[PDB]
Amino acid sequence: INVDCAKLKRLLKETAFKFKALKKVAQLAVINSLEKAFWNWVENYPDEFTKLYQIPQTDMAECAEKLFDLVDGFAESTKRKAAVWPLQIILLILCPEIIQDISENNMNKKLFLDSLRKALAGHGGSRQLTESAAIACVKLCKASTYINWEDNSVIFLLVQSMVVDLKNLLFNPSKPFSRGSQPADVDLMIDCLVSCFRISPHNNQHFKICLAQNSPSTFHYVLVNSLHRIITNSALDWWPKIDAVYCHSVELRNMFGETLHKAVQTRSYKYLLLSMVKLIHADPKLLLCNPRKQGPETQGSTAELITGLVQLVPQSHMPEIAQEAMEALLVLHQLDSIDLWNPDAPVETFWEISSQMLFYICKKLTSHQMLSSTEILKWLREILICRNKFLLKNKTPPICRQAQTKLEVALYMFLWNPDTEAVLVAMSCFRHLCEEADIRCSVHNLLPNYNTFMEFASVSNMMSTGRAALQKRVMALLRRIEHPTAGNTEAWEDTHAKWEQATKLILN
C-alpha cells in the first residue's frame, strides 16, 4: 500500500499500541511488512525524509522506541534476533538525535549496535547472525544515500561501509561463501555496490575488484546489472552519475569480446551476455565513449562491436538474446548515436559498417530459411529508414552496390515465401528501397523498374486477403517489370537452384 509520513505515524502508532501480546509467528510477518513499507515511503516521497534530518519529528521516534523495546524482548538472542536486526536498524535511522547520543536507558541500543559491528566482521557467532548483520548494514547504506550531507550517520556510514567487514564479506575475489540457498544474493550484492558507488563516485577500488579478468564472472554479472540500474533508476542520488564511469570503459568492450567468444561455444555466460547486450540497448555511449581504437584502422573497435552483435542475430540457439541484439543494433542506428561511432569522419566508417552489416544479413538470410526470418525482415524495414535519414542529414560504392544488390535478392526471394507476413513486409519495404534511390538523386537510371516499385507500395497497402489472391497480384506485378538487373537475374538463378533441389526432393 501507499504510505506517507503521517500515514506511517498512524501505522506504527496503531501497531505499537496493539503490539502487546501478539502472536510471535504473526509478529514475524508483521515485522516483514513493517520493513517493506518503509522503502515505499522512501521511494515515493523524495524530500520528506530530507526534512526528517532537518526538523526532527520526535513523535515518530517516541512511537518507534516502544516497538524497539518489545521486538528486542522478542529476540531472546535466538534465531529470531536475526529477524529483529533489519527493521531494527531502520528504526535507529528514524531517530536522528539518539545516533549522536549512542556515540541512560539508551544503553540497550548499544547491546545490538556494537554487536552489529561485532557481527559485521564475522567475529565468532554463527553464519546466520553474520548474514543478517550484512543484510542490515546493506539496508543501512541503501537508506543513508538519501541523506544530503547532514553528516549525522554519513560518518557512521563511512565507518561501516569502506570497512572490509562490509566489503571483504561481499566483494571478496575468493571465498564467496555468501549463503547456501542462493550462490550469491545478487540483489544484496547490487544494492551494496550501487550504494557504494553513489556515496563515493570517484573511488574506484570496488569497480576494479570486479572488472578484473581473473575475478569470477559472477562479480561481472553483478557489475553489469549495477550499471544498468544506474542507467535506469535516476533522480534519486541524483548528484552521482555515469559520467565518471565513462572513462572506465576499455575493459567493458574487452569483456564483451571474451564473453562473446565463450558464448559462441558453467552456463551463466548466456545470462551475462544477455545482461550486457541489454545494457548496450540501455546506453549506447558507454562501450564506445572510450579511447577510440576504431581510430586505428587495423581493426575498428566500434566496427568490431557491431560485428560481434551481428554474429548473434541469425543464431536460434539463444533466441531471446537475438531479440535484444536486434533491438540494440536498432538503437545504435539512431540519428544521434551513429555520430558517436567515429569522432572524426563518421560518414565513411558508418556507411562501410552499415553496408557490411546488410551484406552479412542478406547473405545469411538468403542462405537458408529460419524461424525468426519474418521478424528479421521487419527489422530490415527500420534499418533502411534510419540510413535514409542519414543521407538526408548528410546532404561511393567500394562495397555498397554489392550489399545493395544482395538486398533486393533477399526481397525477391521472400516474394515467394509461404508465410503471408513476409510477403507483405518485403512488398512494403520495396518502397523504402526506391525512396532511398530517390534521395540519392529524375531519370532514375540508377534504379530501373521504379514505377513497378511504387506499384509494389500500392499493392502492399490496399488489402490483406488469403494467400492465393495476393499470389496472383504478385505474379502480375512480377510480369509487369521489363528492365533486367543483376539482382533480378541472380535471384532468378538462386530460385531456380532451389527449385531443382526441391523437385528432386519431392520426386524422391
Side-chain angles (χ1 to χ4, degrees), residues 2-20:
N2 187 14
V3 162
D4 204 4
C5 296
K7 324 197 167 178
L8 190 49
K9 295 173 183 67
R10 291 189 56 185
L11 294 174
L12 188 153
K13 177 66 173 65
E14 280 215 10
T15 55
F17 83 91
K18 73 182 68 177
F19 183 75
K20 273 317 306 172

Side-chain angles (χ1 to χ4, degrees), residues 214-495:
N214 51 0
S215 288
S217 308
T218 314
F219 299 84
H220 293 247
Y221 169 78
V222 175
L223 189 140
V224 57
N225 283 50
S226 60
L227 276 296
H228 193 291
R229 187 182 294 273
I230 301 152
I231 291 295
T232 49
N233 284 7
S234 306
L236 294 174
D237 316 329
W238 73 271
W239 58 94
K241 220 180 188 310
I242 58 169
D243 315 330
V245 188
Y246 283 167
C247 307
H248 186 69
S249 169
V250 287
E251 64 275 2
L252 287 81
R253 60 167 54 174
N254 292 337
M255 182 179 72
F256 180 74
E258 292 84 4
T259 316
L260 176 59
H261 164 54
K262 305 157 194 332
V264 159
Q265 312 175 5
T266 53
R267 275 75 175 175
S268 294
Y269 309 86
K270 316 162 195 173
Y271 317 136
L272 192 152
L273 205 64
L274 189 149
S275 308
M276 294 178 71
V277 178
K278 285 193 60 42
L279 182 162
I280 297 169
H281 161 51
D283 175 57
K285 317 186 182 184
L286 179 60
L287 277 296
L288 53 87
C289 185
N290 218 9
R292 320 285 203 279
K293 184 263 288 180
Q294 180 74 49
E297 58 94 22
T298 180
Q299 182 70 10
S301 56
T302 80
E304 186 177 36
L305 182 65
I306 290 190
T307 58
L309 285 190
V310 163
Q311 281 168 321
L312 295 164
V313 56
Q315 293 180 356
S316 286
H317 294 76
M318 63 184 73
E320 62 285 345
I321 297 89
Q323 269 89 66
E324 69 273 15
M326 261 304 288
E327 185 47 59
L329 285 173
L330 192 148
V331 174
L332 301 184
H333 275 265
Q334 217 50 62
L335 298 174
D336 52 355
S337 63
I338 50 179
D339 297 331
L340 302 165
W341 293 9
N342 217 10
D344 62 299
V347 182
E348 190 276 331
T349 58
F350 164 77
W351 274 122
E352 195 274 309
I353 197 53
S354 168
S355 58
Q356 153 74 37
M357 181 204 47
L358 266 76
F359 167 79
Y360 182 79
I361 283 300
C362 289
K363 186 262 290 181
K364 184 60 68 174
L365 184 62
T366 53
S367 69
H368 186 254
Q369 167 70 69
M370 295 296 172
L371 278 77
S372 62
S373 294
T374 51
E375 289 78 14
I376 290 174
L377 193 54
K378 290 186 283 290
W379 173 59
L380 291 203
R381 185 179 296 113
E382 290 96 9
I383 298 300
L384 292 184
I385 319 171
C386 309
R387 60 187 286 163
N388 300 342
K389 308 175 182 184
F390 178 84
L391 188 153
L392 188 153
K393 286 207 167 182
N394 280 250
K395 306 315 292 171
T396 48
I399 207 176
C400 301
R401 287 291 90 80
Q402 169 177 347
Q404 192 65 252
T405 56
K406 193 69 53 63
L407 163 69
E408 70 265 12
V409 163
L411 302 192
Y412 287 125
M413 194 144 168
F414 281 168
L415 276 168
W416 59 261
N417 193 67
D419 302 346
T420 315
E421 299 87 3
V423 188
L424 272 295
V425 168
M427 182 178 72
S428 77
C429 65
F430 266 98
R431 205 196 67 256
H432 296 79
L433 190 151
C434 81
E435 88 186 7
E436 180 270 348
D438 180 74
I439 303 170
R440 274 294 179 100
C441 49
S442 187
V443 287
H444 294 323
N445 292 121
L446 279 74
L447 186 61
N449 296 318
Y450 164 77
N451 293 318
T452 70
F453 293 147
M454 295 299 291
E455 186 57 38
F456 272 120
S458 57
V459 76
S460 78
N461 65 11
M462 282 74 75
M463 186 66 204
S464 304
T465 44
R467 72 177 292 277
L470 61 85
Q471 278 282 352
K472 276 75 70 177
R473 275 176 298 274
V474 162
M475 292 265 198
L477 293 181
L478 285 171
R479 273 194 304 276
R480 287 193 69 251
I481 72 172
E482 70 278 350
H483 298 120
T485 318
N488 286 105
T489 312
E490 189 50 45
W492 197 99
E493 302 160 35
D494 300 332
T495 300

